[PDB]
DNA sequence: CCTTGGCGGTTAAAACGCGGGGGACAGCGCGTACGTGCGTTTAAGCGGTGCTAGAGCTGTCTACGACCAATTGAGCGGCCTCGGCA
């Protein structure tokens, strides 16, 4: 996890995916002053394991490409270091049923 | 929502000042072997007929290989067949 101070030049931004299978995640120091997951409007995200994911897809008989999506640069996906193909489970408050579990898959 | 007018951001290296430290430029000392103007005597050099002929200069003659014109054969590229490595 690489925290920088002011900016990251676009030329230097191409040096990040060239260092695989190790993963590098960059963050601007401003963006971390507040932990956004403590906000009222952000419900608790929990990444599903590979076994739980497979069990989920069979229950709904669905292709991976049919789930709702979250972009990789989304703030909560970056916070969790989500990689392509991984699913988050989102349990959020509902005024009609009380509790409701929503699933999203990361692009 | 998309593509130009001028503007930061994008590298290999030199715009090298300038800190360090020494190879080596030009003047100066000494110092020796070689070095030309003048001197001698010479052996070849410049200019003249005398003699004798080789082949250039210029002339016309006789002549054999190329020009541009119709034939036509071999090398090469595009189809088309044959064949063993994967």
């Amino acid at each position: 996890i690489f925290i920088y101070q002011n900016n990251i030049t676009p030329s230097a931004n191409k040096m990040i995916p060239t260092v695989s299978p190790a993963i590098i995640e960059t963050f601007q120091e401003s963006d971390l002053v507040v932990n956004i997951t403590h906000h009222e409007l952000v419900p608790k995200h929990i990444r599903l394991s590979d076994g739980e994911k497979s069990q989920l897809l069979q229950r709904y008989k669905l292709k991976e490409s049919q789930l709702p999506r979250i972009q990789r640069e989304d703030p909560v996906a970056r916070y969790l270091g989500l990689k392509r193909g991984q699913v988050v489970k989102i349990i959020r408050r509902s005024e009609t049923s009380g509790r409701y579990a929503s699933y999203r898959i990361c692009l």
Side-chain angles (χ1 to χ4, degrees):
Chain A
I1 296 177
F2 192 78
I3 290 91
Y4 61 95
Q5 291 180 4
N6 298 339
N7 60 328
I8 294 182
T9 64
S11 53
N13 197 166
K14 305 313 175 293
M15 288 284 175
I16 285 174
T18 188
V19 73
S20 60
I23 308 179
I24 297 298
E25 301 179 2
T26 64
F27 293 87
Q28 187 176 17
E29 189 181 356
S30 304
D31 298 335
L32 300 181
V33 178
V34 173
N35 185 342
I36 59 103
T37 65
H38 295 286
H39 202 281
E40 285 183 331
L41 306 180
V42 184
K44 297 296 185 289
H45 298 49
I46 297 174
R47 165 164 70 108
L48 293 188
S49 69
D50 289 330
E52 283 172 334
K53 164 176 173 178
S54 183
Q55 187 199 17
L56 172 70
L57 294 206
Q58 299 174 33
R59 176 258 177 289
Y60 290 110
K61 306 183 183 176
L62 55 79
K63 297 183 299 181
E64 288 189 352
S65 61
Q66 275 165 345
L67 283 166
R69 296 175 189 171
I70 181 166
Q71 282 184 355
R72 206 180 295 167
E73 68 264 16
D74 189 278
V76 185
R78 282 175 61 193
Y79 183 94
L80 294 185
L82 274 195
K83 320 179 283 293
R84 185 177 65 94
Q86 305 184 348
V87 181
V88 287
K89 173 175 184 192
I90 302 152
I91 304 180
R92 65 174 183 177
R93 185 200 63 88
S94 174
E95 68 174 7
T96 58
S97 63
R99 172 171 285 157
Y100 174 78
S102 156
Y103 296 92
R104 303 183 174 265
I105 187 178
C106 183
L107 293 170

